[PDB]
Amino acid sequence: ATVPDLESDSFHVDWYSTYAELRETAPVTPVRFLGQDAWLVTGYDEAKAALSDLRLSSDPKKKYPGVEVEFPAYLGFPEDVRNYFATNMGTSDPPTHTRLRKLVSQEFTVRRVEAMRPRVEQITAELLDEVGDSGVVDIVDRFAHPLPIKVICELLGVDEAARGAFGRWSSEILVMDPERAEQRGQAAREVVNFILDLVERRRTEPGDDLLSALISVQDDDDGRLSADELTSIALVLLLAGFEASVSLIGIGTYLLLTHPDQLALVRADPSALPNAVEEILRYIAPPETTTRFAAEEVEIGGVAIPQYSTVLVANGAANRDPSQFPDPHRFDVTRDTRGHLSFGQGIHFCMGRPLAKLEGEVALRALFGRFPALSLGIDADDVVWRRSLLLRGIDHLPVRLDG
C-alpha cells in the first residue's frame, strides 16, 4: 500500500483538499510522520470519539514495558527539557490532570481575563496608532503578534527585556523539521531556562499577576503545585499566549479580507463579530492536529488501532467534514459553528478560550473599525502558510491601510 507522509507538500499546500481525500477513503488511516508510524483521524465523529476515549493517553512521560515512543511535538527535545514541557494539564491523564486543572482554574478565571479587557483594548489602540494611516505594513509583525505577547506578559509578569528573545524560541518550536531537530532542541532548552529564572524571581518578589497567584494557590484536598508542575504550567501558558492568538488574529484578518461579503456583515452588525471569530476558528483551526497514545487497543470508526500506537487527531480536518458542517469549505460568519473542535473536546478542552476570544474580537473590531479601507497587500494565492501541523498560521501578512 501507499502511506501518506504528513511532511509532504500535500499537507501544507491546499491541504484541506488532501484531508477530504483521506476522509472519503478512510476516516482513520495509517500515515507516516517524522519517520514514524501513526494513525491520522480525519473524520468528525471519529475525532470526537478519540478525544473522548481515555484509553488514548495525552501523557508522553509514561513508560510502557518494551515501548519507546517519541511523539512529534517533542522532536529534538532532551528528556529533561521534555519533562519541563510535559508536566502540565495537557500532558497529564486523570487523576493528575484533574487536580492540576482544578488548582489552575482557581486563579486563571473568567473574572481575571475579563478584568483585562480595558488593557487589551488600550494595547490594541496604541499598536494601531503607530502603524500609520497610509501605506503597506506587515499587520502580523506590527499588530497580530505584539498584542497577544503584551497581554500574556502582563498576565504572567514577563518584563520587556525577556520578550522578543522568547519569541524567536517559540517560533522555532512550532516547526517540526527533522533537519532542525538540534536547533529546535536548543530553543526548547532556552525557553526552559528562561522559565526557571522567571519563576525564581517571582518567588523572591511577589506580585498580583497570575504566576504569583499560582505559586500560593492550594486546595484542602489537592494541596499545591510542586516546583516542576508550576514551572511546566508557566512555560505552557506563556507558550500559548505567545503563539495561539497570533494565528487567530492573522488568519482571521486574512479571511475577512478575502471574503468582502462576510466582512461587510461584521461592519454592519458588530454583534455578529463573536460568531465571526468562532467561524474563523472552525474554518482554519490553528491546532491542526493533537496527539494521543493508545495505551490499549482501541477501535475508532470501525478500525482497530493497535496498542502502543500514536494517534494524530486532525482537529482541522474534522471541522471540514460535511457530515457535521454542510459546505464546510464555505467561510460563513452566520453559520452554526456549534460543535467545532478547534478548542478541543472533553477533559482537555482549551482553558484559554476566554482569553483567545477576548483578544480575537477586540483586535479584529479595532483593526477593521479603524481602517474601513484595509486591503491585502499581496495576491491571496501568494500568502505563505506556516508549515506546522502543531499550530497553523501566517508569519507575514502585508496589508494596505489607506486603500
Ramachandran angles phi, psi of 109, nearest 5°: -105, 170
- Answer left, alpha or beta for residue 132, where phi above 0 means left and psi between -120 and 50 means alpha: left
Q: Does position 254 bind ligand KTN by CB under 6 A? A: no
Contacted entry of ligand HEM, ligand KTN, none for residue 255, CB cut-off 5 to 8 Å set by kind: none
Binding mask 263-282 for ligand HEM (x = CB under 6 A): ------------------x-
Identify whether 52 is a catalytic site residue.
Answer: no
Per CB under 6 A, the segment of 24-32, 239-247, 265-273, 297-305 that binds ligand KTN is 239-247
Q: b/e map of 81-94 (b: 16 or more CB within 10 Å)?
A: bbbbbbbbbbbbbe
Q: Does position 58 bind ligand KTN by CB under 6 A? A: yes
Catalytic residue among 243, 278, 279, 361: 243
CB of 359 closer than 8 Å to CB of 280 = no
Binding mask 180-209 for ligand HEM (x = CB under 6 A): ------------------------------
Catalytic residue among 172, 279, 359, 361: 359
Cα–Cα–Cα angle for 198, 200, 203, rounded to 5 degrees: 110
Is 153 annotated in a binding site? The answer is: no
Contacted entry of ligand HEM, ligand KTN, none for residue 248, CB cut-off 5 to 8 Å set by kind: ligand HEM
Grid cell in block for residue 185: 532542541
CB of 243 closer than 8 Å to CB of 170 = yes
Instruction: Identify which of residues 146 and 352 has a Cβ nearer to ligand HEM in the complex.
Output: 352
Q: Does position 279 bind ligand KTN by CB under 6 A? A: no
Instruction: Identify which of residues 15 and 33 has a Cβ nearer to ligand KTN in the complex.
Output: 33
Exactly one of 27, 241, 328, 393 binds ligand HEM (CB under 6 A); which one?
A: 241
Q: Does position 290 bind ligand KTN by CB under 6 A? A: yes
Instruction: Identify which of residues 355 and 401 has a Cβ nearer to ligand HEM in the complex.
Output: 355
Q: Does position 157 bind ligand HEM by CB under 6 A? A: no
Q: How far is the CB of 154 from ligand KTN (least distance, A)?
A: 18
Identify whether 350 is a catalytic site residue.
Answer: yes
Q: Does position 58 bind ligand HEM by CB under 6 A? A: yes
Contacted entry of ligand HEM, ligand KTN, none for residue 344, CB cut-off 5 to 8 Å set by kind: ligand HEM
Exactly one of 76, 286, 328, 393 binds ligand HEM (CB under 6 A); which one?
A: 286
Identify whether 245 is a catalytic site residue.
Answer: yes
Q: Does position 108 bind ligand KTN by CB under 6 A? A: no
- Measured from the Cβ of residue 330, the count of other Cβ atoms closer than 10 Å reads 13
Q: Does position 233 bind ligand KTN by CB under 6 A? A: no
Identify whether 226 is a catalytic site residue.
Answer: no
Q: Does position 38 bind ligand HEM by CB under 6 A? A: no
CB of 368 closer than 8 Å to CB of 256 = yes
Residues making up the binding site for heme: 350
**Which residues are near ligand KTN by CB under 6 A?**
58, 60, 71, 73, 90-91, 173, 236, 239-240, 243-244, 287, 290-291, 293, 350, 352, 390-391
Catalytic residues: 240, 243, 245, 350, 359
Residues making up the binding site: 350
**Which residues are near ligand HEM by CB under 6 A?**
58, 89-90, 101, 236-237, 240-241, 244-245, 248, 281, 286-287, 290, 315, 342-344, 348, 350-352, 355-356
